[PDB]
Structure 1
Amino acid sequence: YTMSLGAENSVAYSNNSIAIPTNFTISVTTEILPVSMTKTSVDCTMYICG
């Protein structure tokens, strides 16, 4: 299938029409961010030379 961006929605914009929420919803969203990588250190004379 060809990719579909999303549901095509049309908002009833007018010159005197306003929409106001009568309620709400407390949404808790998780966000993951890496901070540090594995700390490594090498030594040629033992890696490069046996």
Structure 2
Amino acid sequence: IIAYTMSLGAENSVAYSNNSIAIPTNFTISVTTEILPVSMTKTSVDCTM
């Protein structure tokens, strides 16, 4: 078991200049999942029991 300072993310420097633009020539159709709760289990409690 090791302990470490967490890597916050990858490092990327965007090549900015005042007359350069980046335009994609291809694409990727991506499908992702989103699991999201709707209901929960309905409970009934007897008092005297």
TM-score (norm 1): 0.88
Larger radius of gyration: 1
Q: Give me the CA root mean square deviation.
A: 0.5
Q: Percent identity?
A: 100
Between structures 1 and 2, the one with greater strand share = 2
Moved over 2 A (4+): none
Q: Secondary structure at the match of 2:41?
A: coil
CA distance in 1, matches of 2:22, 2:29: 20
TM-score (norm 2): 0.89
